[PDB]
Design a protein around this ligand. Structure first.
Ligand SMILES: Nc1ncnc2c1ncn2[C@@H]1O[C@H](COP(=O)(O)OP(=O)(O)O)[C@@H](O)[C@H]1O
Length: 392
């Protein structure tokens, strides 16, 4: 609401520049997944119906700035879009000098990342991009955490800057979980290290009633509670930090359900056999690879009560069937909850696909760092410039 959306701007007979996420996997000049191209169809369709000309801008892969590289050209993506849309898509390689388009037509620019000044958002390149159209639309959330000429700089100099369909929905789903969640609110933070999720843990610790820690993160908390972890993956350096997190959670009346029991193994492979053990019975030679059935029950209880769920990780190495029970019971609890659920991160997405509960999750973010920076409570430069340019 703080920024303008597609419905708040005049798109009739205007050159409309759209920053999309067409960072799709390519193999031998052919797209192996069309998911992200299918996602931006409503945004493209809407502009076309309003009477404007669409100018698509995107990044692909990791090319070196200031150089052209055919293995990262958006040419196969332009052909892929024309197939899905059924509408002709002109591919512009000389788009910076000029772009020629007529209402009802779609034009695909060559990869932005080739241009000098893109990563640093140079005012030189930002003004050149802004001069190509009348309105700027930002539809690529996965890149909203980076200030770049085609995600941030163009919005400074273009006459009109707004947010597209995908970006408006992503910010709305995330803000419905973070800014003012219907209580109770439960967050699940799982991963290999407390260090990589510390900022997520400190930001959520203030906004939730339930904070479930999982995997390597949970193991560090098990060590903080005084229990022996043996050969389990944990960060010794952060034990003092996780000890403080448990103290602040106590003071703020947050339920951090540290596992009461675990599933331990003597080998890290898909052939190892689970041994259900109380947290206090972990031997030196053993490693915690999943939670126990008592810890699953505690989690299922707490998520049944919740009206908002924020899921960022598993509770076990679910890639191993013998250590998948914990993440299965967690996924099934989230599915049964009917709470507004927001999921993000690769393991969470793999857990959702493996346990086939994708429909039963209200929102699934496919963003990486952009999703994590938002969960950390940080300002996303692409979003902030749209807020400024929305003021009248
Ligand atoms: N008990 C555990 N011990 C070791 N590794 C685990 C355990 N539980 C889960 N993992 C694995 O650790 C990885 C989590 O790392 P991370 O990349 O931070 O997760 P994400 O970024 O998707 O939230 C996952 O691959 C997960 O399967």
């Amino acid at each position: 609401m703080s920024f303008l959306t597609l419905k708040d701007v005049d798109l009739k007979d205007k050159k409309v520049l759209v920053r999309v996420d067409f960072n799709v996997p390519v193999k031998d000049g052919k797209v192996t997944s069309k998911v992200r191209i299918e996602a931006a169809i409503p945004t493209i369709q809407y502009i076309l119906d309003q009477g404007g000309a669409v100018i698509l801008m995107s990044h692909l892969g990791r090319p070196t700035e200031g150089e052209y590289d055919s293995q990262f050209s958006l040419e196969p993506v332009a052909k892929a879009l024309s197939e899905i849309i059924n509408k002709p898509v002109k591919f512009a390689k000389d788009w910076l000098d000029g772009v020629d388009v007529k209402a009802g037509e779609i034009v695909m620019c060559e990869n932005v990342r080739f241009n000098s000044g893109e990563k640093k958002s140079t005012d030189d390149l930002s003004k050149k991009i802004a001069s190509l159209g009348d309105v700027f639309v930002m539809d690529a959330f996965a890149t909203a955490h980076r200030a770049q000429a085609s995600t941030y700089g163009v919005a400074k100099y273009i006459p009109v800057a707004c947010a597209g369909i995908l970006l408006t929905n992503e910010i709305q789903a995330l803000e419905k979980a973070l800014k003012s969640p219907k209580k109770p609110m439960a967050a699940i933070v799982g991963g290999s290290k407390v260090s990589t999720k510390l900022s997520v843990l400190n930001n959520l610790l203030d906004k939730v009633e339930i904070l479930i820690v999982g995997g390597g993160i949970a193991n560090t908390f098990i060590k903080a509670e005084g229990f022996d972890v043996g050969n389990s993956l944990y960060e010794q350096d952060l034990v003092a930090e996780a000890t403080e997190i448990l103290a602040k959670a106590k003071a703020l009346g947050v339920n951090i359900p540290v596992p009461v029991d675990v599933r331990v193994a003597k080998e890290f492979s898909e052939n190892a056999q689970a041994i259900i053990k109380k947290v206090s019975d972990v031997v030196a030679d053993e490693m915690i690879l999943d939670i126990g059935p008592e810890s699953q029950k505690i989690i299922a209880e707490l998520l049944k009560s919740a009206n908002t769920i924020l899921w960022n990780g598993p509770v076990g190495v679910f890639e191993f069937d013998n250590f998948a029970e914990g993440t299965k019971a967690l996924s099934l609890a989230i599915a049964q909850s009917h709470a507004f659920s927001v999921a993000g991160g690769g393991d969470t997405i793999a857990a959702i696909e493996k346990f086939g509960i994708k429909d039963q999750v209200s929102y699934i973010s496919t963003a990486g760092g952009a999703f994590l920076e938002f969960l950390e409570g940080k300002k996303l430069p692409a979003i902030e410039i749209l807020k400024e340019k929305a003021i009248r």
